[PDB]
Structure formats: C-alpha cells, structure tokens
Amino acid sequence: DLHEILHEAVPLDANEREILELKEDAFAQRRREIETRLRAANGKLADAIAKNPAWSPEVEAATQEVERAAGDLQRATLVHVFEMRAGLKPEHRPAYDRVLIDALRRGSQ
C-alpha cells in the first residue's frame, strides 16, 4: 500500500534519504509495534477459541485489540506520509503529491 507506493514511485534523492533516515526507521519501529499487537491479539483469539469456541469476553476483547491496531496503522501511515513530504526538497513535492493523490483517488473508485 501507500507507503510502499510512494517509496517506489517517488524515490528519495541521496540527501533526502540521509536526512529522512531516522524518521523512516522510527516509522518502521511504529509499524512493527502496531503489527505485534495485532499478532498478540491473534494469539489471544487462538487461545480463547481452543478453550471455548464461542463469542466470549476474551474473543470480544481480542477483536477490539485487532480493531484498534488496524485503525492505528492507517493513522500512523498517513502521518508518516506527511512527515516525509515535509523533508523533501520543495521541487520534489509536486510528483510526490501526484503519486499520493492518485493512490487515494484509486482507493476511492
């Protein structure tokens, strides 16, 4: 999806890449953190259903963790897209904007 689309279509120049390296790594770490909650939650679901295959309080709670984590990933990705944009050379923002707006437009049709 959208992070990967931008990184591929619109690659950073050598200075942008050095400059954005800490932010790219912090995003990676954030993404891994959210994904680790979503997997833990899959674990809690396997565990619960092994004990009682039913829509139990454990399964309700775990589902709510999966919900949160899914939404959090989308917010964290969107804020990162803007963060990246800000570190680009002003001359590079138009292509990046096009690629972004097109990706969102695609996602609307």
Place this chain on the structure above:
Amino acid sequence: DLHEILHEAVPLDANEREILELKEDAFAQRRREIETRLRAANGKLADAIAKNPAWSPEVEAATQEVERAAGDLQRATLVHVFEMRAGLKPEHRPAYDRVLIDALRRGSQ
C-alpha cells in the same frame, strides 16, 4: 485471508453448503458497505490533499472514517468466521475449529 483459508478447508454436506452460500452473500454485502465508506473517505482525503497538502479538519475527519473502516473489516471477518461455524452440523464443528485455531496461531507469529 483467514476467510480464504476456511473456505478451502472442511467438507460440506449439501445442506451445510446451501446455508453457508446464504451466509457468504450476507458477508459480501457487509464487506461492500464498509468498502463503500472506505472509498468515500479515500476520495475526501484525495480532495483535501489536492487543495491543501496538510493535516486539516477535513483530513482529520476522513482519517477517522478510514480508521473505523479498517477496524470494521477486521471485526466483520471474525464475526463471519463464527457465522460460518454456526452453519455446520455440531458434529462437523470440531474439525472447523482445529483449522481456525491453526490459522489464528500462524497469524500470531
């Protein structure tokens, strides 16, 4: 994905199949409704960003729609897997639960 796995995944008698096809339609409609809301949000993000490439009131509201949709999808998938289970004769439930448990545990790694 989880859906795709289960699906494969246990034999169905004619009567189970009939009902599980009804349930598949119902799940299809729900997935479409959430997709619609996600698409509508994505358009709004695209519109706002083309106008002003910053985190505006419009971006915020659309991002919250996207978050809720991403979560709704994941809840819907999990509800459906129980709904499918509810279509199976009692005797055939243990085998389904084994595949589901396995799936969720692989999903936790």
